[PDB]
Amino acid sequence: SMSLQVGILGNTFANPFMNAAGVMCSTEEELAAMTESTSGSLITKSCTPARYYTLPLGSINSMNKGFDFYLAYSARHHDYSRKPLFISISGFSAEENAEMCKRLAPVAAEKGVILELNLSCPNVPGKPQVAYDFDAMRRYLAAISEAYPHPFGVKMPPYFDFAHFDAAAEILNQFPKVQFITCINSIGNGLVIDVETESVVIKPKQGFGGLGGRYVFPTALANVNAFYRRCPGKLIFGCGGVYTGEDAFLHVLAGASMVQVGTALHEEGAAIFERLTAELLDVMAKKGYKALDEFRGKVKAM
Amino acid sequence: SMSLQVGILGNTFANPFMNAAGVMCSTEEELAAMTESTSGSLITKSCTPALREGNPAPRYYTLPLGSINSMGLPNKGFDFYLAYSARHHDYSRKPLFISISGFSAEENAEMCKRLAPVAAEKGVILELNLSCPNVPGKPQVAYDFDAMRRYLAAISEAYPHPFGVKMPPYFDFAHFDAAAEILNQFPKVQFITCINSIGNGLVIDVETESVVIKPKQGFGGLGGRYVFPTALANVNAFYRRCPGKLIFGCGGVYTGEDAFLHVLAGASMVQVGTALHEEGAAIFERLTAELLDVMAKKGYKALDEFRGKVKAM
């Protein structure tokens, strides 16, 4: 009757849900829990070649086992009969990312793991989000496209004006290997102070860190839709502020193919996926929808 | 004993609270209500040289944790706010700020030339809006550092008095540093208001499957609880980088504890937008009481005992 299936990148995903990179995906036990859950997919922690605080309305963070570990997991330890796997990489240079992609390529070809390239980590000492520098963004994507023979996706930071949406999309549309865009990473460099101690709540970088959870939901929907509109030849994955199936429904209406869950999954654990699928199917049932293809991107004007 | 007084800009303010520009400050009745309130100050709606009727409605919507707006600069025009400052405002009640938001550097310079004698005679204080996120086809001016410098140079040439700037949020230290470096080169910039709304969010209603505000495909500026950690970050980042300037905090204030944290991050004044839209001007009685409660539990007698004194871990 109804289905949450999503048929993309050549795979049938059972439902659109997965963890957000960095949440519940660092240890063998966590990857196993994600694999055993009802999520449609899972992604690893952003890795490099070789901290968190719960807030009333979400989270702030300033946060790997190395690329070797997550490659070996993708190569020999992940059960692909359960669900597909994504791997996130966030090298410190175009070259570091490229050397990783060259080593990832035989594993992607043989097992099917899919690369998400992180251009938006807001916590790299002395180095702003890569995708806030459009010249650097273009060099990274050219370097990866030359080094990596396979399709990949990009994790984007939020933008806040149409001139930036336009410029980012114009660059991404020049790279046909970029088959998906994940909107969004955390809202960078927020600051939380505790009233009683009069002190910041995370230690690095004078307390500044990336925001997730309820704080980011309208920004996340805006970025999903902005890129859905400007990159019709690519898929958009939504990430940001998802706590319920209604939240996921709104991300799909904005354009999302997959829906990633970060802060809410950190708080609730992998059982959240059982609740999210039920809730989303319930919204669909009330509206008579039978498939996500019927309303993905179909947000209406007022 | 305890006190919320602020002594800045050659004025004495009874407490740090004021409305945020654009909230409860467009008509004479709203301005009189703000003046009759217990707020420490007030600011007018950002104005353009001529009156504007604004974007089509609905252009504001109440969210679970705040607001979204595409107001589109509806305002009675500069001549109306100038007349308010020159002839109607009771300065014995509290100091007044005037917000201006012309569509180019030259429009703002022309308004400043006419404002200058009124500022001199009456003492109204200029806040220049460099961050409106709802101008058709033109991004936040302060997201274009070359344009920002041009605006500050044009105003500085045209306007003899010190003034403040309403800034959009930034999200990385490279931008904090670039913005600060520019502001520190303009001696007439005496205060920096952090922040305007987080631009170009989007809200969709589950039932209608439609955007909830009409203009610009539903994209609009976010206020309220969504913006608080970003606001505090911006206040503190500029407080650290522009020690020669005052910082005014704006964003996410609903309680005296929220205000306390703005001040701890560096705020001299604290502006209230969405929460004031919702509660009305009695909010200022509650915010002062709550802020005094925080101070009493900590033994603070004056805001300078803790302003800017956020601690590391």
Ligand SMILES: Cc1cc2nc3c(=O)[nH]c(=O)nc-3n(C[C@H](O)[C@H](O)[C@H](O)COP(=O)(O)O)c2cc1C
């Ligand atoms: C503790 C933590 C660690 C994260 N680590 C990563 C990471 O390694 N790579 C990445 O792309 N995003 C990382 N993120 C960002 C999330 O993937 C997600 O983009 C963000 O939290 C917004 O989603 P949410 O509102 O559901 O939390 C991290 C988020 C948190 C809270």
Ligand SMILES: Cc1cc2nc3c(=O)[nH]c(=O)nc-3n(C[C@H](O)[C@H](O)[C@H](O)COP(=O)(O)O)c2cc1C
């Ligand atoms: C309806 C509305 C109208 C606004 N109009 C202006 C404006 O004219 N000038 C300006 O500088 N900011 C304007 N703003 C932004 C507010 O001054 C403020 O920066 C923002 O709402 C964040 O504060 P808050 O979290 O308390 O709402 C407006 C905000 C709202 C909600």
Ligand SMILES: *[C@@H](c1cccc(O)c1)C1C(=O)NC(=O)NC1=O
């Ligand atoms: C950035 C990050 C990249 C690689 C490794 C690591 O530990 C972190 C990261 C991000 O992308 N998003 C976020 O919210 N927090 C981070 O630390």
Ligand SMILES: *[C@@H](c1cccc(O)c1)C1C(=O)NC(=O)NC1=O
């Ligand atoms: C921007 C605005 C620009 C020009 C004139 C005017 O009256 C307002 C405005 C802003 O600064 N902040 C906000 O949240 N909404 C807007 O529409």
